[PDB]
Amino acid sequence: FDEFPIGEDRDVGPLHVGGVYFQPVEMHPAPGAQPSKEEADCHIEADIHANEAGKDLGYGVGDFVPYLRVVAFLQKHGSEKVQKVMFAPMNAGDGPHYGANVKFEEGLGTYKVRFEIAAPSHDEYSLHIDEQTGVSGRFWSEPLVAEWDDFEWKGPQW
Amino acid sequence: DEFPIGEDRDVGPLHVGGVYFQPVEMHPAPGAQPSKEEADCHIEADIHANEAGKDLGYGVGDFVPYLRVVAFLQKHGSEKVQKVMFAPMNAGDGPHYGANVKFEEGLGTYKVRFEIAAPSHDEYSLHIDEQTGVSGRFWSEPLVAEWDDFEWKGPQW
């Protein structure tokens, strides 16, 4: 299926982050707050894999990084309104990603698109820290940010 | 030094391995697992997608996250069963479902059963549209990987 870029891929902390968008999808179970395939404008996806700095956390470099909490903020140029979109983990035909069906609430135009990526919640993931089997890295405390200041929403490309 | 619980199993879309080795220190320390000092060992359930596998959108060999894994231990000659809830974590060699464990009934031969449940309803999704989506669906009842003659003789380290 056709994917369109949001902007240039970013390397932030131990993460390589890509952003793409494409036609709205039908998800099962549907994230309850996300617009249906009919009501959405598009599906946005954050593709997140460990980079070389991720090795210190125990991830294989290039592997998908699960259990993260990803939120996107969309803000049309010249507007003070900011849309907050919670992404959810899911599999598509091409593997796991974090994503959401969305609506660009202020219509066609240029938007600032920001992904804020939080490490796993305290009780959802652990690291081995003993010298023998452990890792020397640790999860980031402040969310990591990947952003594009001039994304053009020019309507469906499908 | 890692030791197998038994031979790897292929159950549905999962390639499941079980190994044990010395206790580890985890941060945060999960649920009610014993500390590195209190534990007998660390047991890991290594779960990766097999060819069947691709039907859910995974790539062969990929770690399968968001699963809920529990182990049941029963010493031969005993009616008692100990439940071990595994937690997701990274070690220096990558992601695993693991747990520090203290064998309540001590030394002996055990029946070891891993029950693997698909992600919770609100924890994961599949694209199901024709265009972007997948044909497979998660399993309802937990998948089982079992070894009947696991020998616990004490630390091998």
Ligand SMILES: [Cl-]
């Ligand atoms: Cl913003």
Ligand SMILES: [Cl-]
């Ligand atoms: Cl937290």
Ligand SMILES: [Cl-]
């Ligand atoms: Cl910032």
Ligand SMILES: [Cl-]
């Ligand atoms: Cl049992």
